[PDB]
């Protein structure tokens, strides 16, 4: 199938924040591909990295890399190392990414030509896809996305186009996808944490019937971290859902460790420093504990990173999760429950309790793969009539 159907996408919006001060170049990112393999992600969303004199159309060149990020040969070296490790590279081409308006305020035709020419240039350079954010600020965005998708997909079927929106409205999303029907789109459709399990259920099912169960993306934002919208108690629950919904789950760097930009005083909400160990944030040593880092969470089976790796492994290998056949049945007020299946492979049952109270819930007995909370027998069959969920608990079960 398509490569972006086979696992999660990983957005690295800031190279210097992801790696450390001064090491924010393409050559340095080569040394993090092993870690990204451990997350079992199938594609990186990189950049933007092009020359962009802020709010100046004439002095913005989508075909030239800002020297602060490396050279074109550094980029080619990064592409080959990622290809040798089965990781694909998506290049973000949002033109005025250093200004307040991402698409400038003038010369819509010149800006669109810059993007169109950048598509053809970087496709010849060997990139696997592109991302364009802040689509709502682009006049006739639906038409431009159609022209850009045709060019990207006419070069090769294995090339992807990702559009991003701040919108959470369904008609505004459906009209952007109209002339495309193949565009992977990210939005704030699920951004509201306060929604109950019944409402999240309604959001997912209503979107899939309005889109005719077409392949889509699943995420809480077009660029932001999960902690920008969710409290800590809901992080594990939402990671179970995003990895088990029909489509491509898209995350931002740090989501795997529950990175919280507010936890680091002064850090930008958009590009916080990635916490590898206790030396990652030397500004305020007391602000970072070991349980907040990649090094510390990698030693903890109960950590959010260990759950991310387990769910990502299941998403990229089980055929029921790789293909988009999905049915969610009514099962309670604060419950979101659904089954995932494909032909005759192993089927998966997902039960999500969004509420603060224990709520009650196909074979009679199924084997529990994991839970978002400790204290259960993983690898010992449970039953789906006396199923009882603790607050904010999510269950993933197996049955043939």
């Amino acid at each position: 199938q398509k490569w972006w159907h086979t696992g999660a996408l990983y957005r690295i919006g800031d190279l210097q924040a992801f790696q450390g001060h001064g090491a924010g170049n393409l050559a340095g990112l080569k040394g993090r591909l092993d870690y990204l393999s451990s997350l079992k992600v199938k594609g990186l969303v990189l950049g933007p990295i092009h020359k962009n004199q802020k709010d100046d159309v004439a002095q913005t060149d989508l075909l030239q890399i800002d020297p602060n990020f490396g050279s074109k040969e550094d980029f080619d070296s990064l592409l080959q190392s990622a290809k040798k490790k089965s990781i694909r590279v998506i290049l973000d081409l949002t033109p005025n990414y250093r200004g307040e308006n991402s698409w400038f305020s003038t010369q819509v035709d010149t800006v669109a030509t810059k993007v169109k020419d950048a598509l053809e240039f970087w496709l010849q350079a060997g990139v696997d896809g592109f991302q364009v954010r802040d689509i709502e600020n682009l006049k006739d965005a639906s038409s431009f996305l159609a022209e850009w998708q045709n060019i990207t997909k006419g070069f090769s079927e294995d090339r992807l186009l990702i559009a991003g929106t701040n919108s959470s409205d369904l008609q505004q999303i459906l009209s952007l996808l109209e002339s495309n029907k193949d565009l992977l789109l990210t939005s704030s459709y699920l951004s509201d944490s306060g929604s109950t399990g019944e409402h999240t259920k309604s959001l997912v099912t209503q979107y899939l019937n309005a889109t005719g169960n077409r392949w889509c993306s699943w995420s809480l934002s077009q660029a932001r971290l999960l902690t920008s919208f969710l409290p800590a108690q809901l992080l594990r629950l939402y990671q179970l859902m995003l990895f088990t919904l029909p489509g491509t789950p898209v995350f931002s760097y740090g989501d795997e460790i529950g990175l919280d930009a507010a936890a680091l005083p002064g850090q930008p909400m958009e590009a916080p420093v990635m916490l590898w160990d206790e030396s990652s944030f030397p500004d305020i040593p007391g602000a970072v504990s070991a349980n907040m880092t990649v090094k510390g969470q990698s030693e903890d089976p109960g950590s959010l990173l260990s759950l991310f790796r387990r769910l990502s492994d299941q998403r990229s290998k089980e055929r029921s999760l790789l293909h988009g056949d999905f049915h969610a049945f009514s099962a309670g007020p604060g419950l979101f429950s659904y089954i995932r299946h494909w032909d005759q492979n192993e089927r998966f049952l997902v039960v999500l309790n969004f509420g603060d109270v224990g709520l009650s819930a196909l074979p009679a007995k199924a084997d529990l793969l994991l839970s978002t909370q400790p204290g259960r027998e993983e690898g010992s069959p449970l039953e789906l009539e006396r199923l009882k969920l603790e607050p904010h608990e999510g269950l993933l079960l197996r049955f043939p």
């Epitope: 001060h21 005083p265 930008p268 206790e278 030397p282 305020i284 602000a287």
Partner: antibody, heavy 123, light 112 residues
Amino acid sequence: VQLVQSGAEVKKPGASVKVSCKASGYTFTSYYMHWVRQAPGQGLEWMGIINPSGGSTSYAQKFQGRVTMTRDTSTSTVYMELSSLRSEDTAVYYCARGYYDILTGSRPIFFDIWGQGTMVTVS
Amino acid sequence: DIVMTQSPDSLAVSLGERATINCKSSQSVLYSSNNKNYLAWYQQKPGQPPKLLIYWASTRESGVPDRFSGSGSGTDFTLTISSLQAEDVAVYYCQQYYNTPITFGQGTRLEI
């Protein structure tokens, strides 16, 4: 290279006060801006931090809910606003620039450039 | 939150004599990663903002006379003045920046 704050202000209980802090002589968006207040004859108390490149803030819990820090990059000015003023808020309010370690690219929170100060008196 | 305690609260020392101010923190401010102590010393004269004297517990800011020196590690720190001079009458504060919130000492007054 200096920081110049607005003039002294007198306010009634329950009112709000907004102190400005204009920067000059350096790249404004590269240095974090902190606020420290000092009651007459008392010690120093750190209020919070604003980063001019993005506007993200972080306030001490003692002031969470009453303090708001904003920035204007065009005028290179930082604003601090305190609401629900009481008698304990009578103090001199300083804006201070956060140190930048050129060697390590880190910003440890000690203050090399201070503002003149602004006396706020509450009835 | 880290509490800073200075000692003494007031200090009288004649001219050209050794002045010693101590600062204790309820929690070690020694960062094991870079082996640095996140402590600073300030000097404040009446009607003026505090002025940064020492940081990293013992590194002196450029422009501060050689007589000022900072020492200590972990939880105990000392600001020492070799030979007291006339323009040194001020209140001296220590400040930790190991963690947030940033906290100061209560301050030591230095008179002749």
